[PDB]
Ligand binder design. Structure first.
Ligand code: NI
Ligand code: NI
Ligand code: NI
Ligand code: NI
Lengths: 570, 122, 100, 570, 100, 100
């Protein structure tokens, strides 16, 4: 008995060779392989396969290779591949990717993916499943920002801040042991993973290091606190001892040095260069040259992503507000203006496409949009396909190479940069079950269901008073994973090794899962998945023209994007 | 009679900044090819290497400009600026690591500046 | 509909603008939140219409005049800022001194 | 180099001799002194002063005189003065008022106000900063009342109730050990400071005292529970032993006695007379004479504040609902009517202006508006300036004397009355960092940011999905101080000394800061800051005419107020 | 706009009134919450217009009549209470037996 | 009014429909949430009018046509579901393929 491909895909989701359009973009992903056995697909419902004695095993206890949760028929989009599989979760972690069901009667069941009495089912047929987004440039300014992030598929927030204080409104910094302790306590009520950055400023080691011992997961060097050669040096000395990452927003003003002076202070040590294009900050006009260096892990923030006809016009007033500047001070305006360059924004699109900028991030509420990291990643990829063509690496008319390059920018690469990729950042066995389901028509725009530690935390769902959950109004809502004490088990607070060793979680009464930051001093650009390119980037100091391999990098701004007015009510 | 909610009615007169401190005027050039902007409270001797001026005259001093303002030097631009004396303990730590102690140590500060290529040391 | 948090919040602005416009239409001089609501909803609807950010930065100065609002309201509003989905994605419109 | 005054004030906020209009009132406050050193003002942002090696010290650890938080350039309005200073916070307390920055290079830095690696910054330039309001007449009826209070700058709620039960809807009473324990537990989730009043009723000591031992912070005597000579006496005997305050709403009906009988039962002991004018309750018509006595701490509730053309018409139906009365019972209506007198309401305006009524309060949800204590204080002051003129005590055309008299009514005086002024109620070194920032255009109307225990708890802030926090809609929102376990460290539960000694917090699992009620039996009218006047108040039993020093006190109702239709959407 | 909690809530009342008025205009007899919403929004808009509390206490009895509402609705509404910002600050309007 | 949770939420739908109808009236092709809002509010108002579930299941297919909406919107909406109080209590209306 044979099933035609259209009918097969409508019942079980796509299989090998089938393509799926991402939202209303012109990007197509192709199923590379499929772990199923045709005829033994898992499915749940009335009269379906996952029933006792049939596709559900009735013999084994939860310990005997049985799952807590099976996602059936997922189309996985990940740096590791674009492929069809069931995903098995147990103890809040991904334990199997393969084929779930009952070895009693089905062929090809992955041995630890038994559907048993203990197993819940989520139907992923017809959905794209990705890792939760890892946003490493978060300003903690307004707690309402968490749901905004969850709604666009973000599951980890790394950054700093104490609320709408001017320091936090400008910089991703939770300063000092007391503010850090307070924000670790606040984090107990935030339904998302969190890591906190201390102030990467000082000329003595102890004031910086005591933040790490207090529970910070990294440091932020920011020009608004003095991005001086001394602060850069001391922060990196601390980071090398503590095994945490340092993010830098460099000296735009060139007050104490030019880019080359900052690089000399870094002295070959590992660093995460935030908003490397420079609208979000850094040595004017040439900061983006950072992204050529082997010891730099470069990210963009999102308002420059991608280059559009309205991009430049929004930026001056945005910057003035964020950095507490005054319109009537000419040098304030000159500083702001110096950061805003169509030449570097246009080149930034291309550097993403070439794998020279490795990461995306938001800059949430401080020149960035908390719920648009994922959104703008795909808009950038789409613009580049339209303007540059399919990448040379592609085959069979699919955009799989580009899709892997771009998904890596907001999943695995930020996790690697931060020292947290042992826990999060990809759909791999042994990692925490932070998973996002998307309907392809809404891919990258509005997440269907966001799973955190194996329980749904956020979902687009309808009328709670209705007979079923689909009637209007369908809106983003927090789910049971966020309620009561379950918020503790479904989320991770990432902390330094020293704070963990010193018992900070017990001292503060933290009940969340505690994640250890590690292995972030022994990495470089080479470790950025699908985005590992080192090169000499030349930026003309007069014209701001950007050159790589002797070629000027430029492209046009676009008047329209996909993933925009078709979807949004405002 | 028109009411502007929360409006100020400021007193007469003017505010003198850095009152009673010695002032010094010096010429400074940006010899580099990118702009350099210098804030009110940076120890003046520790600014960007490619600013050319008599470095000794920046020791223990900063710009005599309102707190939070700056002087901007475009590439190749020479300007005359007025400096005031640092106050408090007259110690500087960090920044460019030229001082790390009393600003009285002019010989040490200049030795370090010269060795590191800060322009304008005799 | 798949409403996200911002879509839900921004419905309120439209509603407050409708309220304020009814008040204006029956002859009332508008107050501070009324004036802000009208100008804000104007901006977001302009984005929906496909105007540019630059167009709205200027048009926003011509929505209400001082004779439309109570004494002191023009001086209370230093600027109005609003984000909306333009044809090219979300952008910020800042209108300086919208009521002279 | 000199800066003109207009430009100075626009950059750093006003300085000595400058005046600021309070909202749209005709009240002007003048800066009395300024702790800065001109030229060394602290400010934060891009290229600003608070940067490492400059205005931020890079040497000292958090213990070495470094702050957790600096509010820069605040215009303080407090009973202690109207003046310009930086405010330094550490461990959740105000530790310095003076000049912050870096002693390395700045003149005049207050020694314990170093901006270091550990320091967050809030820009207060151009803001008025006051202590959080202390509302001592709160009915705990609807938890939604907390945000209403925070939005108008209230940070402490003292009162009683169990929710919308008739006892609580009428009286500020949480009755008995079990209801008190339950409400102490509820309080763990309320983002505001709290103290709970037990029922001040009984003819034996033990039933009253066991409430104090259970964790009550005071008692309420209320006529709806029988404001008899016995209940008055026993409550005050308990209070004198326990060192807590007693609030009284006296026998309006004159059922068991006239005012003189209540005063005889009080027998010279300290008492807080609620709604002393009497619309909110008390011996008809002459209760307000209480406010002349040295042992009485007199407050008003807010619906009579100030006397307006619509005041009388709203009151009858309000009272009927609150006190569970029936329109068809003539004596119910007669009781209600007996409380509502334009003669005493008009005199109440003047008694406030003369410093004879010392405190304001809400009466939240039981003949009072939870978010209008601060609002109506300033409307009263403005009305009195318009009708009475500047006070004789004023100078240079400022209203500073009136401003200090009136701010004291809702900050320091209620704190003194309750025995909590060692912790809260003013901007002074050593007190808890409950601070409210106001834009002058919104002063007394809508708070900008409300700081609780050194962390922002509530703020007027915009779109959480935007690039910056200023775009619309700007509305009041809970901030990180209210989230997770941080709600425990940023708020105080005030309790009796005996309950604390007996381990009630541990017994109930209370995690909030625990404040001790003390020193409230050894005070009197003389201890009410700027409102310490004792005098014979004569109230004519026939005409309700009020006389002080042989002079009739009367004024006209007004048709319009400031701080009203310019600001509110409804 | 600086919306406080009450301003946000009371937007809902205006919206419910607009809904109810559309229902009335297309010929429907109004139900309990519809009737309450219309009378409530009427009161709050009257305050905004600068009417007195006493005026609104009486006008509130003439907004809807029994032929505008379903059977039993007049007897279900013993009173309607609403607070709004009058020229002289927030005041409470109580309308007894608004529909005879 | 005694609003329950659903009554509060469903006010939003009516508001979004009013917004969308204004956008349509000024000549815009409607997007996905706009189209869903209009059809949903149509259904709930139809229930209020006393139509049957079966009537609304069919009428819901004739509210908007493909020329009223942006490219791809018809194919994005597989069905719309809404519950409302009919004369005989709450019922669910499912409209399949409302825009051809
Ligand atoms: Ni930055
Ligand atoms: Ni940032
Ligand atoms: Ni009372
Ligand atoms: Ni009361």
């Amino acid at each position: 008995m044979k099933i035609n491909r259209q009918q097969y895909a409508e019942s079980y989701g796509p299989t090998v060779g089938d393509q799926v359009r991402l939202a209303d973009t012109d990007l197509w992903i192709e199923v590379e392989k499929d772990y199923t056995t045709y005829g033994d697909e898992a499915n749940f419902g009335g009269g379906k396969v996952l029933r006792e004695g049939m596709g559900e095993n009735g013999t084994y206890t939860r310990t005997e290779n049985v799952l807590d949760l099976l996602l059936t028929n997922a189309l996985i989009l990940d740096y590791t591949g674009i492929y069809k599989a069931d995903i098995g979760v147990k103890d809040g972690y991904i334990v199997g990717i393969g084929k779930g069901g009952n070895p009693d009667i089905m062929d090809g069941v992955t041995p630890n993916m038994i559907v048993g009495t203990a197993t819940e089912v989520i139907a992923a047929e017809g959905k794209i499943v990705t890792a939760g987004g890892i946003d490493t440039h978060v300003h903690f300014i307004n707690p309402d920002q968490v749901d905004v992030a969850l709604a666009n598929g973000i599951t980890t927030l790394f950054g700093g801040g104490t609320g709408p204080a001017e320091g936090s409104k400008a910089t991703t910094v939770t300063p000092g042991p007391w503010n850090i302790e307070k924000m670790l306590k606040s984090t107990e009520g935030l339904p998302i993973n969190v890591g906190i950055l201390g102030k990467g400023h000082g000329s003595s080691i102890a004031p910086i290091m005591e933040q790490i011992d207090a529970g910070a997961a990294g440091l932020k060097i920011h020009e608004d606190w003095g991005a001086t050669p001394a602060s850069i040096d001391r922060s990196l000395t601390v980071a090398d001892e503590a095994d945490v990452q340092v993010a830098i927003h460099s000296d735009t003003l060139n007050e104490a040095g030019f880019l080359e002076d900052t690089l000399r202070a870094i002295n070959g040590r590992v660093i995460h260069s935030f908003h490397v294009e420079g609208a979000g900050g850094g040595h004017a006009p040439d900061i983006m040259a950072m992204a050529g260096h082997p010891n730099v892990l470069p990210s963009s923030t999102n308002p420059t992503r991608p280059f559009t006809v309205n991009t430049i016009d929004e930026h001056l007033d945005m910057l003035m507000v964020c950095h507490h500047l005054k319109q009537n001070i000419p040098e304030d305006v000159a500083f702001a203006d110096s950061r805003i360059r169509p030449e570097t924004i246009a080149a930034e699109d291309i550097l993403h496409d070439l794998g020279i900028i490795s990461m995306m991030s938001t800059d949430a509420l401080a020149m960035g949009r908390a719920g648009e990291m994922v959104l703008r990643t795909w808009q950038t990829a789409d613009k580049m396909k339209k303007q540059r063509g399919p990448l040379a690496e592609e085959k069979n008319g699919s955009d799989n190479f580009r899709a892997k390059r771009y998904v890596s920018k907001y999943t695995i690469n930020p996790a690697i940069a931060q020292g947290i990729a042992h826990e999060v950042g990809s759909i791999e066995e042994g990692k925490f079950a932070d998973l996002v389901l998307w309907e392809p028509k809404f891919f990258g725009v509005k997440a269907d269901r966001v799973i955190k530690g194996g329980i749904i935390a956020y979902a687009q769902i309808g009328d709670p008073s209705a007979s079923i959950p689909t009637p209007q109004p369908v809106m983003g809502r927090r789910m049971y994973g966020t309620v009561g004490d379950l918020i503790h088990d479904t989320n991770i607070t990432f902390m330094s090794k020293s704070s963990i060793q010193q018992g900070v979680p017990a001292k503060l009464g933290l009940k969340r899962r505690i994640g250890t930051v590690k292995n972030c001093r022994n990495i470089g650009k080479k470790d950025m998945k699908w985005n590992d390119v080192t090169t000499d980037i030349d930026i003309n100091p007069e014209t701001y023209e950007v050159k790589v391999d002797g070629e000027v990098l430029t492209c046009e701004p676009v008047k329209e994007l996909p993933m925009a007015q078709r979807y949004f009510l405002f | 009679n028109y009411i502007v909610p929360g409006e100020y009615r400021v007193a007469e007169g003017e505010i003198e900044i850095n009152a009673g401190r010695e002032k010094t005027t010096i010429r400074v050039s940006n010899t580099g090819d990118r702009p350099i902007q210098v804030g009110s409270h940076i120890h003046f001797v520790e600014v960007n290497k490619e600013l050319l001026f008599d470095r000794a005259e920046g020791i223990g001093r900063r710009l005599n400009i309102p707190s939070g303002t700056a002087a901007r030097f475009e590439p190749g631009e020479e300007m005359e600026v007025e400096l005031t004396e640092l106050g408090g303990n007259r110690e500087v730590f960090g920044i460019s690591d030229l001082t790390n102690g009393s600003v009285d140590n002019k010989e040490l500060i200049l030795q370090r500046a010269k060795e590191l290529g800060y322009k304008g040391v005799e | 509909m798949h409403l996200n948090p911002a879509e839900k919040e921004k419905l309120q602005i439209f509603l407050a603008s409708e309220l304020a416009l009814k008040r204006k239409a029956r002859g009332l001089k508008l107050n501070y939140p009324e004036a802000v609501a009208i100008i804000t909803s104007f901006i977001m609807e302009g984005a929906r219409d496909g105007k540019t950010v630059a167009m709205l930065m200027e048009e926003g100065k011509h929505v209400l005049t001082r004779d439309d609002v109570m004494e002191g309201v023009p001086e209370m509003i230093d600027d109005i800022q609003a984000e909306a989905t333009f044809p090219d994605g979300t952008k910020l419109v800042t209108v300086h001194n919208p009521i002279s």
